[PDB]
């Protein structure tokens, strides 16, 4: 069994174990701030440096994984609280899309909302061009910010949010459990064939974006992960 | 939203939030020990005292839940390490089955292996009469110890095991993530309609058992839980 | 440490975590309405269904607690706005006193105003038989509605009141902070030895009452609570 | 009556409503970071710019108040997690003590551990020179970091902590409730005569400090406050 596991209680910009893309910055409190509040169409992303093998071309096996993280989004004067954070998986050579307009692309897709990735978004603005639901929501994305599925949710400014994600390889099911401020949990699950959508090796990470008038603080506070690929 | 959430970092006899059934005991370290090492066919179960309303007949809605717990099973001389621990959900009036022979019934079913419950078992003995796989395993049970589905696992004597479970009501998916000794994760997921299998009010808990020759230490170390039912 | 904590942002009939006694009802908006506007001597009480161990005869330790709740009292035609709401603590077998005349008893005491409970009352009618102050007030009650202590307070019809209560077991101090409509705060604190006045296990809740001519809307809107008993 | 109330969901160093002293800084995420991790004997404090009238030399009346706040302390490599945060009340002309050695002085007292202030300290290091308890603790201080009283507590790195404080002028009682990561609540209360210890007009705020080998992240995330003084 090939296992990749790690844990971040805090981040240090000088740690090579993580790739910093775009406007991402690391605060003195150890938090990763994904976007630059003072830039138009800002986009920042963070990736665990080591690529993870999610499936074997020899056995045909797909890995299962369990990951938990905590983020925080907070409103800022005088901008519309947008656009949200997305936890994504993508080719190891993934980079912020060329000429990215940020905003509703969440830093992972082109203007049409397409890209090569699988993710769980925590969307705080309704983009009609991507068929977003009317309210804040958590969504399961497969190569598009036009979610395969979404569930109503509520982004509380200044609130620390906990998320737990389980990917069961046999059923190809991706399950998400979000722990809100008011105490309630929000869940969403969807069958996504990682082996059919992503290459053998991939990088896991977070991305957030903003536009001209849409901006807010996007912070990653902690992140634990364990993936196990059966090789027997 | 109707939410039920608790977090037991340890336990204590006298705590009104816990119903003890059978040979259950509380160790001075706070751990719960489910079976009596000196009793033939021992059965011990622990339940969260408060009944949980998992679905509403008035709205047809079903709750989602996130729960995680840690346990430990340890060998003893000279008995065969059996039988295992099961995290179950059952009618609020659930009691240890009458005339229970313990053993492979895990304290939740009758001799034939049938009962009224939904659970996640951590089986350490292969009972052919219940069609168990040949080795240790984690299984998803629905009214029977003859698992609807199982996955190879390994119970390490004295190893602390961590488990995270997510039930997404919308998809009716019950997914389990088990973090073992060597740090590898083992997962199993199964679509289970709690609404169709259980009554509106149920109780959550743990059960363990042994036989004349099959005995071992079964400990529950911690348990956190959050369930949310959309009331509207 | 043995801890009981919960957070109700709203309520719903059927939640097994709440015990309804008397004329209480749940409104479509999630608010709990304690009294029946059409019944004489109406009494409604709501209790957290799980008993709380506030102290242990074995260790002698006493729990500390923090709780916040919000309520609203609203006038109606053509009845006299009475009688008020009381947040109370009583033995777990507590029931509305047999033959309750409601009114100034607040649903927790007998006609003489005596009972077995500890509570914080928000009194909107001056009962000379219980030595009430001449104006609305907040009072600390120990086995009697003839408050051990009171402080002037005004109940504004239709106003949302927010309350915060801290019980420090070491000093045995029960401290109350009441946040009015105008923004002013009103506080009252009293040393109350719960270990000497109540049994080890008790229930927390709210009660309200009315008489033939005294009636008003008594609503409980939210309630968060956390108690912790040291078991070491 | 004379009331003062405010609420901070986030802070900005470019806001008049607040005084900054020492090495204090405001992070892009709105959080106030009291100490500088790169300085020896670092000391930082923040104060509500508007002095609050807590008692009257004309009437002898003393104000009551309710205030709550959330903070966060976090370890760093490779220093000792020290020294802590203290919520304090002091004369309006209060400033960081001249030649402050920071450290166990929490930035409010002299080397001997004396000063003019009343406060609630959240201590993460045991200074024997100030008779500190052997573990982390919450303390009530009256002109000295040699606490009038303390209670065992546990500072969890990276955890957001919520505090509620009530001062009841009639009983001169200062009660505190602190919400831990494991869910438990800790409380401590103490009779403190503010009229005798402090001037009519005072300033409320926060202070934190570090030493050569003792440093950690000290954050003040939010702060609500309401005080009411009767003028009649
Ligand atoms: C004319 O539209 C551009 O400028 C406005 C502000 O004047 C917005 O920034 C708009 O972007 C959209 O903004 C929201 C929030 O207000 C959110 O960030 C959306 O994702 C984003 O598309 C911007 N247009 C574009 C296409 O960038
Ligand atoms: C003749 O079989 C009974 O007695 C033997 C020991 O002499 C076992 O205790 C056996 O029970 C089975 O024991 C294993 C462990 O080796 C495990 O506990 C199985 O679940 C259990 O059935 C017992 N027979 C029965 C059916 O109770
Ligand atoms: C003769 O007194 C009885 O009937 C009157 C109305 O006709 C009142 O209901 C009175 O009760 C007292 O009413 C006030 C409100 O005006 C408040 O509810 C008091 O607590 C209550 O005693 C009632 N007498 C009694 C003792 O029930
Ligand atoms: C010789 O002692 C001085 O230098 C050491 C370096 O290891 C410490 O910084 C020490 O200060 C004390 O440090 C702890 C943490 O390790 C905590 O911050 C105490 O409050 C502080 O006294 C320092 N001495 C002094 C008096 O500054
Ligand atoms: Ca969007
Ligand atoms: Ca078995
Ligand atoms: Ca009265
Ligand atoms: Ca100290
Ligand atoms: Mn979306
Ligand atoms: Mn089995
Ligand atoms: Mn009264
Ligand atoms: Mn101290």
- Using a CB–CB cut-off of 8 Å, the residues of A that contact D are 9-10, 25, 27-31, 33, 37, 72, 74, 76, 157-158, 160, 217, 219, 221-222
Return the H-helix or E-strand segment holding B195. helix B194-197
Residue range of the domain that includes C189: 1-232
Rounded to the nearest whole angstrom, what is the distance from the C-alpha of residue C209 to the centroid of ligand 10?
56
Strand partners, D144: D114
* Continuous H helices in B45-166: none
| Measured torsion, CA atoms of residues B187, A11, A186, B70, in degrees rounded to the nearest 10 | 40
Q: Determine how many CB atoms are found less than 10 A away from the CB of residue B116.
A: 17
Return the H-helix or E-strand segment holding B40. none
Q: Name every residue whose Cβ is closer than 8 Å to that of residue A82 and which is 6 or more positions away in sequence.
A: A103, A124, A125, A210, A211, A214, A215, A216
- Is the sign of the CA dihedral B5, D7, D216, A226 positive or negative? positive
Q: Determine how many CB atoms are found less than 10 A away from the CB of residue A40.
A: 14
Domain count along chain A:
1
Rounded to the nearest whole angstrom, what is the distance from the C-alpha of residue D127 to the centroid of ligand 8?
5
- Distance, CA of C206 to CA of C34 (rounded, Å): 8
Taking CA atoms only, the protein residue closest to ligand 2 atom 15 is B214
- Is the sign of the CA dihedral D87, D88, D94, D95 positive or negative? negative
DSSP code, position D160: E
Taking CA atoms only, the protein residue closest to ligand 3 atom 4 is C212
* CA dist A81 → A213, D32, D118 (Å): 9, 21, 39
Q: Determine how many CB atoms are found less than 10 A away from the CB of residue C135.
A: 13
DSSP code, position A110: -
Return the H-helix or E-strand segment holding C47. strand C43-48
Q: Determine how many CB atoms are found less than 10 A away from the CB of residue A139.
A: 26
Q: Name every residue whose Cβ is closer than 8 Å to that of residue D135 and which is 6 or more positions away in sequence.
A: D126, D152, D153, D154
Helix (H, G, I), strand (E, B) or coil at C181: coil
For residue C96, what is the domain's CATH number? 2.60.120.200
Q: Name every residue whose Cβ is closer than 8 Å to that of residue D14 and which is 6 or more positions away in sequence.
A: none
Here the tokens at position B111 are: 């001799």
- Distance, CA of D138 to CA of D150 (rounded, Å): 6
Phi (first) and psi of residue C77, to 5 degrees: -95, 140
Angle at Cα D184 formed by Cα A9 and Cα B176, nearest 5°?
55
- Distance, CA of B207 to CA of B222 (rounded, Å): 14
Q: Determine how many CB atoms are found less than 10 A away from the CB of residue D107.
A: 34
Q: Do C173 and D188 touch (CB under 8 A)?
A: no
Q: Which residues of C touch A182 (CB under 8 A)?
A: 7, 9
Helix (H, G, I), strand (E, B) or coil at B116: strand
Kindly provide the resolution of this structure in angstroms, with one decimal.
2.2
Q: Do B189 and A182 touch (CB under 8 A)?
A: no
Here the tokens at position D115 are: 């000063």
Here the tokens at position D103 are: 């450290």
What residues does the ion ligand 9 have nearby, CB within 5 Å? A 123, 132, 139
Taking CA atoms only, the protein residue closest to ligand 1 atom 22 is A103
- With CA atoms as reference, report the closest residue to C205 among C1, C2, C24: C24
- With CA atoms as reference, report the closest residue to A31 among C127, D31, C229, D62: D31
- Distance, CA of B101 to CA of B111 (rounded, Å): 7
Q: Is D80 in the pocket of ligand 4 (CB under 6 A)?
A: yes
Using DSSP bridges, classify how beta strands A137-144 and D217-229 pair: parallel, antiparallel or unpaired: unpaired
Q: Is A80 in the pocket of ligand 1 (CB under 6 A)?
A: yes
Phi (first) and psi of residue A61, to 5 degrees: -70, 150
Is residue C76 within 8 Å of residue C217, measured between CB atoms? yes
Angle at Cα A205 formed by Cα A202 and Cα A211, nearest 5°?
125
- Using a CB–CB cut-off of 8 Å, the residues of D that contact A are 9-10, 25, 27-31, 33, 37, 72, 74-76, 157-158, 160, 217, 219, 221-222
| Measured torsion, CA atoms of residues B141, A174, B204, B207, in degrees rounded to the nearest 10 | 50
| Measured torsion, CA atoms of residues A185, A186, A190, A195, in degrees rounded to the nearest 10 | -60
Rg (CA), chain A: 16
- Strand (E) positions, B92-216? 114-123, 137-144, 149-152, 160-168, 173-179, 185-191, 201-209
């Amino acid at each position: 069994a090939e296992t990749v596991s790690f844990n971040f209680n805090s981040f240090s910009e000088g740690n090579p174990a993580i790739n910093f893309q775009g406007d991402v910055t690391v605060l003195s409190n150890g938090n990763i701030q994904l976007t630059n509040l003072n830039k138009v169409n800002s986009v920042g992303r963070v990736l665990y440096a080591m690529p993870v093998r999610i499936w074997s071309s020899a056995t045909g096996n797909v890995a299962s994984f369990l990951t938990s993280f905590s983020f925080e989004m907070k409103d800022i004067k005088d901008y519309d609280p947008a656009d949200g954070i997305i936890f994504f998986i993508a080719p190891e050579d993934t980079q912020i899309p060329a000429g990215s307009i940020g905003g509703g692309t969440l830093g992972v897709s082109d203007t049409k909302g397409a890209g090569h990735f699988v993710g769980v978004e925590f969307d705080t603005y309704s983009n009609s061009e991507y068929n977003d639901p009317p309210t804040d929501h958590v969504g399961i994305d497969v190569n598009s910010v036009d979610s395969v599925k979404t569930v109503p949710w509520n982004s509380v400014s200044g609130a620390v949010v906990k998320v737990t994600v389980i990917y069961d390889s046999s059923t190809k099911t991706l399950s998400v459990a979000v722990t809100n401020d008011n105490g309630d949990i929000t869940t969403i699950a969807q069958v996504v064939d990682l082996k059919a959508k992503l290459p053998e090796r991939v990088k896991f990470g977070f991305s957030a974006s903003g536009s001209l008038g849409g901006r807010q603080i996007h912070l990653i506070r902690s992140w634990s992960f364990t993936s196990t690929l059966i090789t027997t």
